[PDB]
Design an enzyme around this catalytic site. Structure first.
Site, mmCIF file in Angstrom:
data_model
loop_
_atom_site.group_PDB
_atom_site.id
_atom_site.type_symbol
_atom_site.label_atom_id
_atom_site.label_comp_id
_atom_site.label_asym_id
_atom_site.label_seq_id
_atom_site.Cartn_x
_atom_site.Cartn_y
_atom_site.Cartn_z
ATOM 1 N N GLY A 1 40.229 -42.144 -16.126
ATOM 2 C CA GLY A 1 40.543 -43.510 -15.753
ATOM 3 C C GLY A 1 39.541 -44.097 -14.781
ATOM 4 N N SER A 2 39.885 -45.244 -14.206
ATOM 5 C CA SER A 2 39.019 -45.913 -13.245
ATOM 6 C C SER A 2 38.956 -45.141 -11.932
ATOM 7 C CB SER A 2 39.505 -47.341 -12.990
ATOM 8 O OG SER A 2 39.605 -48.069 -14.200
ATOM 9 N N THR A 3 40.059 -44.485 -11.587
ATOM 10 C CA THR A 3 40.154 -43.747 -10.333
ATOM 11 C C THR A 3 39.544 -42.352 -10.442
ATOM 12 O OG1 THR A 3 42.393 -43.021 -10.918
ATOM 13 C CG2 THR A 3 42.192 -44.984 -9.541
ATOM 14 N N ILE B 1 39.617 -38.362 -13.129
ATOM 15 C CA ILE B 1 39.852 -37.660 -14.384
ATOM 16 C C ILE B 1 41.231 -37.013 -14.411
ATOM 17 C CG2 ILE B 1 37.390 -37.160 -14.472
ATOM 18 C CD1 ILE B 1 38.011 -34.265 -13.877
ATOM 19 N N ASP C 1 49.801 -53.192 -14.023
ATOM 20 C CA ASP C 1 48.854 -52.654 -14.995
ATOM 21 C C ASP C 1 49.582 -52.125 -16.226
ATOM 22 O OD1 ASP C 1 46.228 -52.242 -15.800
ATOM 23 O OD2 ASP C 1 46.175 -50.178 -15.055
ATOM 24 N N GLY D 1 41.652 -36.758 -20.256
ATOM 25 C CA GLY D 1 41.590 -38.188 -20.026
ATOM 26 C C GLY D 1 40.741 -38.565 -18.829
ATOM 27 N N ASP E 1 50.302 -44.212 -14.481
ATOM 28 C CA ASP E 1 49.163 -44.946 -13.931
ATOM 29 C C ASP E 1 49.603 -46.022 -12.941
ATOM 30 O OD1 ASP E 1 46.645 -45.991 -13.428
ATOM 31 O OD2 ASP E 1 46.039 -45.969 -15.537
ATOM 32 N N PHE E 2 50.009 -45.594 -11.749
ATOM 33 C CA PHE E 2 50.445 -46.517 -10.706
ATOM 34 C C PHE E 2 49.346 -46.757 -9.675
ATOM 35 C CE2 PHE E 2 55.019 -47.216 -11.348
ATOM 36 C CZ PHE E 2 55.268 -46.307 -12.358
#
EC number: 2.7.11.1
Length: 290
Positions: free
Chosen positions: A31-33, A35, A141, A29, A159-160
């Site tokens: 994300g914005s932050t 991998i 989110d 996966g 996803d915090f």
């Protein structure tokens, strides 16, 4: 400034190198932050999830600090547990529990859920939110992307990255964060908001589990947010496929006035959640069982 942030985060994370006991990394996966990778514990052979985040490749940067600080010791059945955090070179690694079932997004976009499975998902999320909101933590989110499943069909929240804290002194947040299609009207209007924004976002995720996608999903992100801000609460395209019990439950979620919106504690006693089946009822939805 980069080296200044490395030293601060160093004082927070656990000492040592996770590569000393982890083996065979593989991306599953992104994300914005950063991998996400599957790693094998060399000593036992058990699988874990590792979140790699390059420090010199982020926007706000201080949100990496947020997830680590706020959720360093947090333990809940319906929340993805954060085991340890490490500073590897110029990257922040976070070892989390591995949920083999994958994300809920893969399910809502490939198959259709019944009201038994939908209620089971909402029950688990509301159980996590009720505890989080009681301690002053807001996810900000909530969506199908942030929802993960175990191999036996247990639902957990993850996803915090956008999470924040509220208290008696500061009961409201003001930041514009989250994913546009799941944002609450008062959040888009830049009004001081509280934990109620998670309830609205959950309402949008219910629409996801029914229609397959959030409202105005075809419209550009900037355009969709204006529609949520100005127009009446979004309705289901497949309202005819929905029982009156689910409809009434959704009407308590998608309320424009945040004061009229039901809290997580109230929704836990809603008649619709009595249809929530066991975790085993979600198992046939996962990819390896289709």
């Amino acid at each position: 400034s980069h080296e200044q942030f490395r030293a601060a985060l160093q004082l927070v994370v656990d000492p040592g190198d996770p590569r000393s006991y982890l083996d065979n990394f593989i991306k599953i996966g992104e994300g914005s932050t950063g991998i996400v990778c599957i790693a094998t514990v060399r000593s036992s052979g058990k699988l874990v999830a590792v979140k790699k985040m390059d420090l010199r490749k982020q926007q706000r940067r201080e949100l990496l600090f947020n997830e680590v600080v706020i959720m360093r010791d947090y333990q809940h059945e319906n929340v993805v547990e954060m085991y340890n955090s490490y500073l590897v070179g110029d990257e922040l690694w976070v070892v989390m529990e591995f949920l083999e079932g994958g994300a809920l997004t893969d399910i809502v976009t490939h198959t259709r859920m019944n009201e038994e499975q939908i209620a089971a998902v909402c029950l688990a999320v509301l159980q996590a939110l009720s505890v989080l909101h009681a301690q002053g933590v807001i996810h900000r989110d909530i969506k199908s992307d942030s929802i993960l499943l175990t191999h036996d069909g247990r639902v957990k929240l993850s996803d915090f990255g956008f999470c924040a804290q509220v208290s008696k002194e500061v009961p409201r947040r003001k930041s514009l964060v989250g994913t546009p299609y799941w944002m609450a009207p008062e959040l888009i209007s830049r009004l001081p908001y509280g934990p109620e924004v998670d309830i609205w976002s959950l309402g949008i995720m219910v629409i996801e589990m029914v229609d397959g996608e959030p409202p105005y999903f075809n419209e550009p992100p900037l355009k969709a947010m204006k529609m949520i801000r100005d127009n009446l609460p979004p309705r289901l395209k497949n309202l005819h496929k929905v029982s009156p019990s689910l409809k009434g439950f959704l009407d308590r979620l998608l309320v424009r006035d945040p004061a009229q919106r039901a809290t997580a504690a109230e929704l836990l006693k809603h008649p619709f959640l009595a249809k929530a089946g066991p975790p085993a009822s979600i198992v046939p939805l996962m990819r390896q069982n289709r």
